[PDB]
Amino acid sequence: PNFSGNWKIIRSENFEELLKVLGVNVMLRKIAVAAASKPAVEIKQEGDTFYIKVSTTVRTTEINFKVGEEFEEQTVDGRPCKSLVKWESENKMVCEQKLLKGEGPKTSWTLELTNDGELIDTMTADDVVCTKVFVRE
Ligand SMILES: *C/C=C(C)/C=C/C1=C(C)CCCC1(C)C
Known part of the structure; x- marks a missing residue:
């Protein structure tokens, strides 16, 4: 499994709904949904080391991590967290997030490469x- 590539979106579900239940107000949701409904995603994978760049009309997010090693991130609604990616299976990784301060919903992201x-x-x-x-x- 090599996740490396420039990835182009073909389907999306529930993006605005995710922001809504996280408490993002409607004005900011509409900006976010417009800016980020065709996110450009580039991945460079070198074994267990990953670089991911997600580009929208208003944001560039670059993430660098090694599977199994903690790194710093913010959640999708902007809260500082410590993150840790593990392989769930050979083709799917899961990023668990822990808030640095305070309490809140449990947040995560996953990436899976299908056959x-x-x-x-x-x-x-x-x-x-x-x-x-x-x-x-
Ligand atoms: C609309 C979806 C996004 C803006 C997703 C961004 C994203 C990934 C696709 C994987 C790495 C984490 C994160 C930046 C949240």
């Missing part, structure tokens, strides 16, 4: 799940 070569991303807050599917350019 057919699609990339499935999920982002969760408690029991609400956003799912996006991409193909390699």
